[PDB]
Each structure stands twice: as C-alpha cells, then as structure tokens.
Amino acid sequence: XXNXXYX
Numbered sequence: 001x002x003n004x005x006y007x
C-alpha cells in the first residue's frame, strides 16, 4: 500500500 483511496 502507501497510496490512498477510497474505492
């Protein structure tokens, strides 16, 4: 991970 979202 390390990214974000939310999906």
Ligand SMILES: *[C@@H]1O[C@H](CO)[C@@H](O)[C@H](O)[C@H]1O[C@H]1C[C@](C)(N)[C@H](O)[C@H](C)O1
Binding pocket: none
């Ligand atoms: C997502 O990242 C932001 C920026 O660093 C934080 O401020 C936030 O608390 C964080 O969201 C938490 C809560 C969430 C959305 N339910 C997920 O569990 C994420 C991984 O962590």
